[PDB]
Amino acid sequence: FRKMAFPSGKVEGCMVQVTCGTTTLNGLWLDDVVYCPRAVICTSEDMLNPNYEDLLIRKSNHNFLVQAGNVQLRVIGHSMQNCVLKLKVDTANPKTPKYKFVRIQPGQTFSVLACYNGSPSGVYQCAMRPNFTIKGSFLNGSCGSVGFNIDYDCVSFCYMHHMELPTGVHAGTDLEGNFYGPFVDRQTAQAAGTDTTITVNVLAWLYAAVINGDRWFLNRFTTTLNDFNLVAMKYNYEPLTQDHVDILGPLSAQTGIAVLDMCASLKELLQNGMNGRTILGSALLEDEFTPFDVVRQCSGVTF
Amino acid sequence: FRKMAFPSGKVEGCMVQVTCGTTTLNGLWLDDVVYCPRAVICTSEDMLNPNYEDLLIRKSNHNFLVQAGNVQLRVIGHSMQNCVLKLKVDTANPKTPKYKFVRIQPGQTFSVLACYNGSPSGVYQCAMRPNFTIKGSFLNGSCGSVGFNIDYDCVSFCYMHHMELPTGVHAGTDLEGNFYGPFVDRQTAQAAGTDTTITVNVLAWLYAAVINGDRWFLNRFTTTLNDFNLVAMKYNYEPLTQDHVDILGPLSAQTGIAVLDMCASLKELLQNGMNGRTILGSALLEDEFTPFDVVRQCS
Ligand SMILES: *[C@H](O)[C@H](C[C@@H]1CCNC1=O)NC(=O)[C@H](CC(C)C)NC(=O)OCc1ccccc1
Ligand SMILES: *[C@H](O)[C@H](C[C@@H]1CCNC1=O)NC(=O)[C@H](CC(C)C)NC(=O)OCc1ccccc1
C-alpha cells in the first residue's frame, strides 16, 4: 500500500520557464503553445488587486522570456484564457506526448510534478479534496507545476498550481484556466470550506482490505443509498453519487460484496468505534486511494 | 508533508524488456550494455535450485530477446557479474544519462521505478531497512526494476529488484549484483533478521512536523546522547551517533530546537506512547524520510 505516482518522464519533457520582468515561474510546452499562470505578468505591487486585462494590454510578445533549459523560445503571440496565459512560440515541442485536458472531480487522485525555474524537482500523488484544495508540497517559484494522470499512452493534464492558502493547503486551475473551488488569483485573504472525508475512496480502501484477507468489519446487514448519505453527513463524510456507486462496481464484483453492503459496514464503523482494531494495519481510515488506485496496485497497469 | 520521489524520466529512457525462453523481466540499458537479474535464464524447475554457471554456459547470444519498446536489440555478448547478467548489444542507448553505481547503507532512501514488460508503471520512495529489506510494491514480472537517486544531473543507481519474501517485503541487489542482506536468488522461503526503527530519520520527521506547526510533543527537557541511546536500544531503535547529530544540524538551526532537546521529546513518546494523537496526520512514528529528504522538501 504505497502511494504510487505515475512515471513523470512524458511531462518532464514539456516543462519550461517563463519570465516576465523579474518574475519567473513554470510553463507547459505542448505543440507550439506554452501554458502558464497569468500571475507571471504581476509585480509585487500588482498582486493585491491586479487588473489582469490592463496589465496584459501593456505587454507585447517581446516582454516574455520562455526558456527550455537555457535555450530561448521566441514568443510570437499571446492571449489570456481565464487564469492561464497562452504563449504561442515559434517551435513545436518534439517531445509533445499524446495528451488531453480534463477537469477532475473532488476525490480523484493525480500525480504532481513539482518544478522550480522550469526544472523538475519531485513527484508525488495527491487527491483533490472535497473543498477543492490539495494537501500538496509547494515552495515559492512552484507556480505552473502541473498535475496529471496517464491513461495507457495519453497524458491527462488536470491541474496547474497557482497559490497557497493561509492554512497551508494549495489551490489552482484546470488547464483551461478555471479555478477549482471559489478562489481567485490575487494575494488576498481566502479561506476554503470545511474539508470532509472522501467516502468513495474509504470504500475502495475497505475493498482492498477484503481482497487482502482483512475482513473482520463485514456485517450481516445492508442499507439504502439515501439512508447512508444522510448518516455520512453527520460524521463529515461526503455523500455518495451515482457515479461513485458505478466506479466501485469492479471491486464489488471481484469480492462479491455489494456496494450497499459495504456501506452498511462503514456505517457501523462510524457509529461504533474501531475498538483499537486495525484495517490494513492502520488505526485510521485512508481516503486518498481511488478505486482505480486500488486496481493499479493489485494488477500492475503500465504505460 | 508527502513522500516525494525523484522525477523518473532519466531512468524511463533506459528501461527495456528481456526475455529468455518463457521468462520475461526488465533490464537497464546503459550505453551498449543491458543489466538484468540472472534469474531470467531459469525455468520454473531451475529456480528451485539453480546452478547459474551451468545454466549460463548452456545459453547462446540468440537465446536472449531484448526489446526497447518496438525495436529488438541484438545481443552480441553476455557475461555474469554476481547476481546480474550483462548483455552486450549492438546499439548504444542515446538516452543514457550521466550515472554512477552506488551501494547504499540502511536508513538511506531512494526512488523505485516499478516496471512490467519493460514499461514504467509507477514511482515511489522507499528506505533500505536496517535488516536489508525494502517495503515495496512489486508484482509478478517486476524483477529488474531499479532504485535510484538523482544528484544534480547524475543518476545514482543503487538497487535492482529480485524477490519477495513470505512476509511481503522485498529484497534485491546493487548494480554490481551483490545482494543487500543474507538473501540468495533461489526460489525458497527466506526470512529476514529483526528490523529496527531508523532513529535519525524519525528525528528528521519530528523536525518536519515542527516546521509545519505540529508541536504538541515538545517539552522543555534535554537529555544526553548516551542516556537517549539506552532508551532507544531498549525499544529496538537504532542508536544515534555524533555523525547523526551533525547531519541534523540544519533542521536544528531552522527550528531553534537543539538535537538533544528533540531526543528528549522522542524519548517521552517511546516511553509514554502517542496516546491516540497524530503527528503530521500519522498515528505512527515515520522513519523513511532522511534529514536530506526533509531539507529538500522544506527549503
Ligand atoms: C507561485 O509560485 C506561488 C506559489 C506559492 C508560494 C508559496 N507556496 C506556494 O504554493 N504563488 C503565489 O505567490 C500567489 C500569487 C498569485 C495568487 C497572484 N499568492 C499566494 O499564494 O499568496 C499566499 C497568500 C496570499 C494571501 C494571504 C495569505 C497567503
Ligand atoms: C521477478 O519478477 C519476481 C518478483 C516477485 C514476484 C512477486 N513479487 C515479487 O517481487 N521474482 C521471483 O519470482 C523470485 C525469483 C528467484 C529465482 C530470485 N522469487 C520470489 O520472489 O519467490 C518468492 C517466494 C516466496 C515464498 C516461497 C517461495 C518463493
CATH of the domain at B261: 1.10.1840.10
Instruction: Annotate A36-63 with three-state secondary structure.
Output: EEHHHHCCHHHCCCCCHHHHHHCCCHHH
CA distance B65 to B30: 17
Q: What is the widest separation between alpha-carbon atoms in chain A?
A: 69
CA distance A159 to A145: 8
Question: In this structure, which ligand is nearest to the CA of A165?
Answer: 1
CA-based nearest distance B43→chain A, Å: 23
User: Residue A171: what residue type?
Assistant: A
Using CA positions, which residue lies closest to atom 9 of ligand 2?
Answer: B164
Cell of A160: 496547474
B94 near A CB under 8 A = no
Mode of pairing for the β-strands spanning A15-20 and A65-68: antiparallel
CB contact set of B39 (below 8 Å; sequence gap of 6+): B23, B25, B47, B50, B83, B143, B162, B185
Question: In this structure, which ligand is nearest to the CA of A25?
Answer: 1
Q: What is the DSSP string of A167-214?
A: TS-EEEE-TTSPBSSS--SSSS---PPPP-B-HHHHHHHHHHHHHTT-
Closest-CA residue of chain A to B14: A9
CA distance A84 to A173: 8
A225 near B CB under 8 A = no
Tell me if B48 sits within 8 A of B187, measured CB to CB. yes
CA atoms within 13 A on the CB side of A29: 25
CA distance A143 to A251: 37
Partner-chain residue, chosen from A7, A139, A297, that has the shortest CB–CB distance to B137: A297
Q: Quote the DSSP letter at residue B134.
A: B
Contact A4 B114 (CB under 8 A): yes
Tell me if A195 sits within 8 A of A131, measured CB to CB. yes
Distances from the Cα of A96 to the Cα of A75, A91, A92, B249, angstroms:
18, 11, 8, 43
Give the mutation candidate from B1, B2, B140 for the A interface (greatest A CB count, under 10 A).
B2
CB contact set of B177 (below 8 Å; sequence gap of 6+): B38, B80, B81, B82, B83, B84
Using CA positions, which residue lies closest to atom 27 of ligand 2?
Answer: B189
Closest-CA residue of chain A to B10: A9
Question: Smallest Cα–Cα separation from B205: which of B136, B298, B273?
Answer: B298
DSSP-based three-state secondary structure for B210: helix
Distances from the Cα of A90 to the Cα of A10, A30, A72, A94, A204, angstroms:
21, 12, 10, 12, 46
Contact A122 B9 (CB under 8 A): no
The rounded Å distance from CA A21 to ligand 1 centre is 18
DSSP-based three-state secondary structure for A104: coil
CA distance A164 to B211: 16
Distances from the Cα of B285 to the Cα of A124, B3, B238, B279, angstroms:
21, 14, 14, 8
Give the mutation candidate from A1, A6, A8 for the B interface (greatest B CB count, under 10 A).
A8
Contact B120 A302 (CB under 8 A): yes
CA distance A63 to A74: 10
CA distance B237 to B240: 9
Question: In this structure, which ligand is nearest to the CA of A114?
Answer: 1
Using CA positions, which residue lies closest to atom 7 of ligand 1?
Answer: A140
CATH number for position A60: 2.40.10.10
CA distance A209 to A204: 9
Mutate to test the pocket of ligand 2, among B25, B55, B162, B184 (most ligand atoms within 8 A of CB): B162
Domain that holds residue A270: 199-298
Determination method here?
X-ray
Helix B259-272 × helix B199-211 angle, to 10° = 100
Which helix H or strand E contains B157, and what residues bound it? strand B154-164
B139 near A CB under 8 A = yes
